[PDB]
Amino acid sequence: AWDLKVKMLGGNDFLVSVTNSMTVSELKKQIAQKIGVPAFQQRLAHQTAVLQDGLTLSSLGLGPSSTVMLVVQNSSEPLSILVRNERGHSNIYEVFLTQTVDTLKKKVSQREQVHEDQFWLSFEGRPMEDKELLGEYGLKPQCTVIKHLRLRGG
């Protein structure tokens, strides 16, 4: 276990205790736990090259002398997800994790021409809240969000 120098662009410099066999993804969880920046918002780079979550540190040849740049993304990168409807069909939606759940509901609402109050979204069993950021739900490329109806009888 050795200390990694992480520098936040525009902000402060930090040390994080890491090991060679630590993933970039675990590094982001350590940073999130240390300074409260959600992992989905962290862009890490070494020698100006963005680090990929599944990669091991040593694999990026990082060491005690290495310096990693942290950029906290105010607007993050596009990704695609699947929204599956109550009829069991899925469609592709493009979102950004720094957007609110409400923006995805409006897109669903506009595409299917349904009032936002006739439905709600869940991710892996967790109801999604309008005002929360999509990123707080752990959405990943091509994951599936489920759309639930609150339709009227009568």
Final resolution, Å: 2.1
- What is the four-CA torsion angle of 23, 29, 30, 36, rounded to 10 degrees? 160
- Cα separation, 137 vs 78, in Å, equals 16
Residue pair 71/57 in contact by the 8 Å Cβ criterion:
no
- Closest C-alpha among 106, 90, 68, 62 to residue 147: 90
Q: Which two tokens stand for residue 122?
A: 């869940």
Experimental technique = X-ray
Q: From CA 112, how far away is CA 151, in angstroms rounded? A: 14
Q: Which domains does the chain have, with CATH numbers?
A: 1-74 (3.10.20.90), 75-154 (3.10.20.90)
H/E element, 24? helix 24-35
| Contact predicate 130/100, CB 8 Å | yes
